[PDB]
Symmetry: D4
Subunit: 138 residues, 8 copies
């Protein structure tokens, strides 16, 4: 059930291809179900911050079993998990671009994209994920 | 006056059993009156973030002599301790799930639960604390 | 011009005496004009967090040539230095209890109190400062 | 295209000269297109916090290809990159004083000023940048 | 194959019992096959350092697939992995008391003991491991 | 003209993984550019957890010191010129083998780092991968 | 059983007085039995490193229940706890100047001095300890 | 008694000029008597490590009141300050290239050079120091 070589290779290829179509250089990061960095690819000229944000988005997706855009409302002032980003010492990113990857009810990894607008990062991520046979929810 | 073996054992057992009833895997953490990690137990499949949040809640409860849900208002924009989570470099958690433990007016420890919704974490924590009948306020 | 032995000893004594009158245990911290820790004194049962907050308040006062309560408005959402506490990795504290210490137009140090309410910490600090011949503004 | 000795020297001198005119001591920092510290200069009595803020402003400008005052709106509560300063563990500063430096469509570095009001920092930075043959936008 | 509740409970009980027989208080730590803290138990008056060293020994065992005493020679001056403890920022401990736990050729976790002499820690760890049906090599 | 291309990165990464498969040792492969930025990472199943940190560090060291990492082993020993270096740089530099600096036409273009086997295996894997593309390991 | 006001005061005074006699400026640090910083005093012109070394020496004494000079042999290459200083991320200091304080078989705190030679730090620490009624071994 | 503008400028220029004569690109760093970074200059293509080592050598010179080559013997296995580089969490560098700057018996700052061989760094640093009216010992 885990991510196979083919899964990893296709996710990464499809993300890079979609980023090229959008004309935005990104960092692509994939983590396994335990949060271990498994693939990283940086396109030329990607924003330097993206080297830290993409793997953090992928990690966040696994570590909270969620897509990172789904955390945006819950960390606001007044919301249930206000302060989370400081409580976890910057390890969680709470804007879009990270998705949890599921197969047959089992969490198999996380994908993180950074380098565009949040909308671009999410488009790239969703396009990549559509290239392989996986879900973004259990 | 201090947490005995029986206190630590029953707090842990009761927390895990309540979490089983709720069908949510959590990390349980107990710290002593000086904030030293005394017991940690991770249920299978608990959110990875919970491994950091539960001990931090337990620590926060002792370090601020308060339940963590009682810090939620006082760290908001405009409130007296705005910014506290950054000032203490992520050591304090300001949402529910941590309680201070008191016996005969003496602070004896802190219990932290993380892995569910905030309300679940607080339910589990309160249940565990009710199993040994210590107080949560001086 | 600098804090003398007598300055340091009287500041510390007066802060502790005032805390005793208020019946709240605090940490007292004094830093020099360069931000080096010079005196620390912890009263029994002071909040654990105060061991970190009091020196940070003192340091903040010198590092920003201000009282720490004067930073509260400027770090709010919408205000000029929003985010400051993260930018400086938790070294600055932006609620009351730290004061800059000045003599003959020269910055000689900083005093930080933590362990009570913000208002108690500011009272203690102001009382201590009144015990020696120094100002809180240039 | 890169920053020459002359570019660095003129930037630094013009910044210091403008700060002297404003009668505010600042830290001046210049990073290259990869974010490596290239020049630092501290004026006597500059706020201690400026030693950390000015290089961070310069680094931010390259790392996000933006002037730092342009990030102020996008990190607010409710905005698209809320929490960014914690996600990047304090490496990015999101109030004014940092500018990205461009020549012939190529990013050649970043300039950061800290020590005055945000407006003084920006005036100093803009004055310095006007002393050499560069743009602040691609 | 993984560590069951019974495995974890017996390891912990047996380590504590052995420590009691030796009259030395220890910290017991167990990590899973991915290095995630699963159980921590601190006996009263265990050396404060043991709170950091026991989990690090358990983690090292899984992270290097080795008992920690088997790393002592290989990190010495002149040996193949000299400097390893600094390369990994203190995450690995290279003296005895940590053991990797294997069942049917599969790595299922790590156990770490700290609080005694290295020889006591190893005794305690070996005694605990003998209480369950597992090997210390693949 | 001489930077690492897509093809360079791809071939380095593939050849490293292929060689690690031949040796039957799972590794982490890391490539950094001439400025030390992480460019590629690839982790093989069951690689030592430590190798997730050690491989990118090796690659970064190679560029940050313009050297192969095995060439630092003597110089950081007790009594040698750069004793303590690993602590001075807060663990960012690794001083045993497996990292190589990558050069073309006298220009530094990147760094490759391998971790997960013995130090010898990591070097073998790195050298094999480097041979798949025609760059040099010295200026 | 604990360090009283009189104990803390006399330790600190006696350490400063001795350091004055020797004409070496030091930092004095005292921690309680849980390792919490209780007193710090810095003499003018004390080595900057001493602001970190002295509290660490005091902490190490309690955390390891030993004098710090007693750790020097055991951390050497080839000895049982080689690497310890990196394993504990610099929290332990292994050269002289820190002493564990005992009364009636109970560990009550730790004293740390830094700023002279190791031998001066030890002379100062020992002179200070001799000013109160305590032992340096259980 | 302090480093003037001219002192800072001349030190920096002379260091860069000597590095050019040796044909090695270095990072030059100057700190004041309190260890605050005052000047940094990076020559093109200086080793990336030098960006961290040169300011650390300058800081070390002031923080230990010594040239950094004078620390080499004292931090060896078997010597009085073995482990120091870890105790201070990498803030001190114990090989040559850093010098303390003294005028009329007063410590006024530190100069640090990194990028060459240790001998080249020391040559550069000594040459720069010779360009102004200061000593390297009290
Ligand atoms: C921060 C790093 C700096 C470095 C490395 C530096 C380096 C130098 C060097 C190498 C020269 C000689 C140029 C030549 O080769 O002929 C020079 C000249 C000079 N620098 Fe600087 N400088 C620095 C900053 C400044 C600053 C901040 C000022 C004034 C605010 C200043 C004022 C001058 C003056 C007046 C000259 C003489 C010629 C001229 O007016 O342009 N320099 N500097
Ligand atoms: C540290 C030393 C520990 C000791 C000495 C210990 C001892 C025991 C004993 C004597 C029992 C009674 C049942 C029997 O006859 O086997 C027991 C039950 C139990 N303990 Fe512990 N325990 C320890 C730690 C833990 C921890 C950390 C947990 C975490 C949840 C735990 C969970 C339980 C549970 C759930 C039971 C009752 C259910 C069952 O045994 O199947 N114990 N323990
Ligand atoms: C890590 C990031 C990787 C990316 C972005 C990536 C991307 C690609 C792309 C774009 C192609 C088609 C290129 C072409 O031939 O025209 C390709 C082909 C291929 N890749 Fe990868 N790849 C990666 C890693 C790997 C690894 C680690 C392996 C093997 C261990 C691998 C094996 C292959 C093979 C066997 C082919 C087809 C053979 C051929 O090109 O004729 N790739 N990859
Ligand atoms: C660091 C925290 C210190 C605190 C909180 C403190 C507090 C006090 C207090 C409350 C007294 C009155 C004692 C009594 O008679 O009951 C006192 C007296 C004294 N202290 Fe301290 N003290 C401190 C440090 C020092 C140091 C470092 C020295 C000398 C190096 C010192 C020298 C004295 C002397 C000589 C007296 C007797 C003269 C007088 O009453 O002013 N103290 N201190
Ligand atoms: Cl915030
Ligand atoms: Cl070492
Ligand atoms: Mg049950
Ligand atoms: Na926050
Ligand atoms: Na905050
Ligand atoms: Na009971
Ligand atoms: Na913030
Ligand atoms: Na934030
Ligand atoms: Na080391
Ligand atoms: Na070292
Ligand atoms: Na070490
Ligand atoms: Na060391």
């Amino acid at each position: 059930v885990a991510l196979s070589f083919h899964d990893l290779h296709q996710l990464t290829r499809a993300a890079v291809e979609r980023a090229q179509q959008l004309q935005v250089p990104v960092v692509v990061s994939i983590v396994d179900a335990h949060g271990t960095e498994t693939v990283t690819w940086r396109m030329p000229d990607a924003l330097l911050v993206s080297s830290e944000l993409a793997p953090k988005k992928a990690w966040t997706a696994v570590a909270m079993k969620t897509a990172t855009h789904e955390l945006s409302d819950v960390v606001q002032p007044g919301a249930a998990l206000y302060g989370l980003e400081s409580h976890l010492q910057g390890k969680v990113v709470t804007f879009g671009g990270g998705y949890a990857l599921w197969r047959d009810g089992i969490l198999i990894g996380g994908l993180g994209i950074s380098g565009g607008s949040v909308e671009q990062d999410m488009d790239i991520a969703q396009t990549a994920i559509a290239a392989i046979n996986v879900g973004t929810h259990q």
